[PDB]
Design a protein around this ligand. Structure first.
Ligand SMILES: O=C(Nc1cccnc1)c1ccnc2[nH]c(-c3ccsc3)nc12
Length: 329
């Protein structure tokens, strides 16, 4: 009922802007960092989300540059990107996903219930996969939160999105400090590793089990007070670097043991995406007789690339089970 034809450039491939048309535009996201709309392309009818951010010709949009080099089933797919209006607005046309870990987590909280563990595995595992993949590029998201984890209810696939706050960390360079904030950040680190993403993911896993934020605090103070109110006080040693009673009864040991190896004061002490993916908490996923709670076949959880594994290839023995190979032969 209201078409909009623009000159868009494919997200992947040699810059060759072609004409693109879309309609049914319906706002669905808001903030000071931009705004996300929904819309349907006219030649395919496919649904998409358009993220509109204000960019100035002085420099290049870092989030655009990062998105353009990404391509993984567990990261929001970029279709096109174009500009609008003096004031320049960059629009990112993404493959639309209907829900988020935030809207789902909240939907379970209003029922005093908790998201079934099978779903927690499925989501957390794919998150670690998206992490392992981008970290191998040296790229750190730097802002993992339930709002940023999109998911499709009927497929049970999670896709990381929102790289407006992400940066390709260059080991050997200063990073200015400007409830998922890792402690090293609270202490305004300047050389922190991409292991900050692991801490945040840890808060998310924890949260999904709990059923509410784990480290609630309006400031680093209150926030850090929580971290201590659960992880206790740090040692002079850890300070430089920078239980089972905490989680609800009946919480699978593997889950509680997994959160303990992610929520460590020492960045280097924490697991890495790849290791996390292979943690026994996800053993059930590597099971041949595993059943997707939805019936449909489980999403491609073992199609790892040499890139996703570069962090430590031999770990492929675990991440890719016997049946996964014979079935992908
Ligand atoms: O990019 C997206 N969202 C976003 C969120 C926060 C900051 N920047 C972008 C996005 C891309 C594709 N499909 C999407 N679906 C949704 C969504 C669906 C229900 S609430 C949010 N958000 C997206």
């Amino acid at each position: 009922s209201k078409v909009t034809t623009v000159v868009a450039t494919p997200g992947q491939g040699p810059d060759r802007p072609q004409e693109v048309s879309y309609t049914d535009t319906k706002v669905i996201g808001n903030g000071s960092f931009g705004v996300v709309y929904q819309a349907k392309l006219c030649d395919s009818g496919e649904l998409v989300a358009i993220k509109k951010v204000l960019q100035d010709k002085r420099f290049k949009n870092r989030e655009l540059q990062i998105m353009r080099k990404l391509d993984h089933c567990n990261i929001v797919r970029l279709r096109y990107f174009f500009y609008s209006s003096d004031e320049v607005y960059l629009n990112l046309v993404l493959d639309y996903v209907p829900e988020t870990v935030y809207r789902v987590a909240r939907h379970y909280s209003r029922a005093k219930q908790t998201l079934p563990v099978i779903y927690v595995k499925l989501y957390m595992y794919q998150l670690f996969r998206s992490l392992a993949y981008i970290h191998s590029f040296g790229i750190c998201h730097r802002d993992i939160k339930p709002q940023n984890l999109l998911l499709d209810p009927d497929t049970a696939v999670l896709k990381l999105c929102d790289f407006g706050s992400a940066k390709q960390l260059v080991r050997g360079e200063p990073n200015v400090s400007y409830y998922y904030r890792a402690p090293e950040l609270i202490f305004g680190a300047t050389d922190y590793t991409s292991s900050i993403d692991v801490w945040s993911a840890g808060c998310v896993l924890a949260e999904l089990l709990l059923g509410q934020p784990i480290f609630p605090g309006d400031s680093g103070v209150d926030q850090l007070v929580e971290i201590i109110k659960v992880l206790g006080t740090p040692t002079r040693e850890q300070i430089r670097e920078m239980w089972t009673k905490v989680f609800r009864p009946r919480t699978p040991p593997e889950a509680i043991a997994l959160c303990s190896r992610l929520l460590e004061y020492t960045p280097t002490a924490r697991l890495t995406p790849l290791e996390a993916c292979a943690h026994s908490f996800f053993d059930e996923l590597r099971d041949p007789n595993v059943k997707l709670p939805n019936g449909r076949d489980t999403p491609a959880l073992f199609n790892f690339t040499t890139q996703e594994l570069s962090s430590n290839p031999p770990l492929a023995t675990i991440l890719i089970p016997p049946h996964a190979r014979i079935q992908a032969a």
